[PDB]
């Protein structure tokens, strides 16, 4: 008679507002619910750093930000990486395109002048 | 007790002038020799049935008793 | 040292006529820290936490743990942060005048020693105890006479 009840408590029965006497902390503490969340957003965070999807620098800022719970679960961290890491790339593509052209014509400026100083 | 992991010891631990008895019990598959001395029950695990009969006769005196099983 | 707001100091000396290590419990002056070479005698220069007999120290030098009479090993001005001041020697009759913590000027015999500097632990009575209990725990550690 106690199993048939517990198999119904797992699903949602017998556990409304009329079956609670303990404080919201007592049923499931706030220290633990936070605590188990830091061990998930930190674990994922350092499973990425070694896997080389983020780097040293990002793993720090994401470490302080998660400590101030700007990320409230795992999906919203897995996603917020996919926003930074993506827009970091596009900035790079517009950064390694800017200097590649800027200098090529600068040494090609340095070469064209040297072919001038030889031929007087 | 003491675990002994070869053969040459089992005589140097059973040729002594003070040694008392040898128990050769047939566990379900290996063999167990237990020579009782003044301080330890010197147990030798040997897992070969066709090697215990080699070691049954080679006990230092005629004493092959008392065994159980 | 429980029952005292002036923490002591385990100074380690060397017996010069046998072979061992002798230890003392000086009242610690202020500034004294472990691993420091404290000197002791008549020809040890002026510096904090370093005993030398009044008479070979200049006029105006602040001392603590000052002896009363030569050889009684420290009696005057040794509470939690008090200090006796030297005033003016008298190299004839070998006397000296000190201004004890209360204010009464004493004509102390010279040649009796006193470790320089105020006594560590000063400024103790500036925190209101604020509690009945906190005064209880204070007077339980001393002679048992509180309420």
């Amino acid at each position: 008679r106690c199993r048939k009840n517990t198999l119904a408590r797992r699903k949602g029965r017998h556990m409304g507002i009329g079956k609670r006497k303990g404080t919201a902390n007592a049923r499931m503490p706030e220290k633990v619910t936070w605590m188990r969340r830091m061990r998930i957003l930190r674990r994922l965070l350092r499973r990425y750093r070694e896997s080389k999807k983020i780097d040293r620098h990002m793993y720090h800022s994401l470490y302080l930000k998660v400590k101030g719970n700007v990320f409230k679960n795992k999906r919203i961290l897995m996603e917020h990486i996919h926003k930074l890491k993506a827009d970091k790339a596009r900035k790079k593509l517009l950064a390694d395109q800017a200097e590649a052209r800027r200098s090529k014509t600068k040494e090609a400026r340095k070469r064209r002048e040297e072919r001038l100083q030889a031929k007087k | 007790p003491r675990k002994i992991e070869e053969i040459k010891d089992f005589l140097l631990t059973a040729r002594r002038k003070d040694a008392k008895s040898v128990n050769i019990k047939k566990n379900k598959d290996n063999v167990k020799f237990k020579v009782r001395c003044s301080r330890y029950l010197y147990t030798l695990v040997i897992t070969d049935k066709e090697k215990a009969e080699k070691l049954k006769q080679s006990l230092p005196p005629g004493l092959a008793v008392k065994e159980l099983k | 040292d429980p029952g005292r707001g002036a923490p002591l100091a385990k100074v380690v000396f060397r017996d010069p006529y046998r072979f061992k290590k002798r230890t003392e419990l000086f009242i610690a002056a202020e500034g004294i820290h472990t691993g420091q070479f404290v000197y002791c005698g008549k020809k040890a220069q002026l510096n904090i936490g370093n005993v030398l007999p009044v008479g070979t120290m200049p006029e105006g030098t602040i001392v603590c743990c000052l002896e009363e009479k030569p050889g009684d090993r420290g009696k005057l001005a040794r509470a939690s942060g008090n200090y006796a001041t030297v005033i003016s020697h008298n190299p004839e009759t070998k006397k000296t005048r000190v201004k004890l913590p209360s204010g009464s000027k004493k004509v102390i015999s010279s040649a009796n020693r006193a470790v320089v500097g105020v006594v560590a632990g000063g400024g103790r009575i500036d925190k209101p105890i604020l509690k009945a209990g906190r005064a209880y725990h204070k007077y339980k550690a001393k002679r048992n006479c509180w309420p």
Binding site: - | - | P7, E30, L46, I62, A120, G122, G123, K127, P128
Partner: protein
């Protein structure tokens, strides 16, 4: 800050002991607990151990300073004069 407007450390006392007593204590339960900088290392790890005794964290050197502070300004001016008196004693 934002949790308490004008109490600070002495908010652990509540509505007791009065106002002016708690104000006078707020300047002492901040000096004594807070960590000073050990002069022998520069590492801010000098924390009061008991009354009038201070301990470092990395040098491991105890310094017998003031009772709620690393130094009481009289004890500094005594260290001052004794320096000055040391030259006059030896010209």
């Amino acid at each position: 800050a934002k949790r308490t407007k004008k109490v600070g450390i002495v908010g652990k006392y509540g509505t007791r002991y009065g106002a002016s007593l708690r104000k006078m204590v707020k300047k002492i339960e901040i000096s004594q607990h807070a960590k000073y900088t050990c002069s022998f290392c520069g590492k801010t790890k000098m924390k009061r151990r008991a009354v009038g005794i201070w301990h470092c964290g990395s040098c491991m050197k105890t310094v017998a300073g003031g009772a709620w502070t690393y130094n009481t300004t009289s004890a500094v001016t005594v260290k001052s004069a004794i320096r000055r008196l040391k030259e006059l004693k030896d010209q």
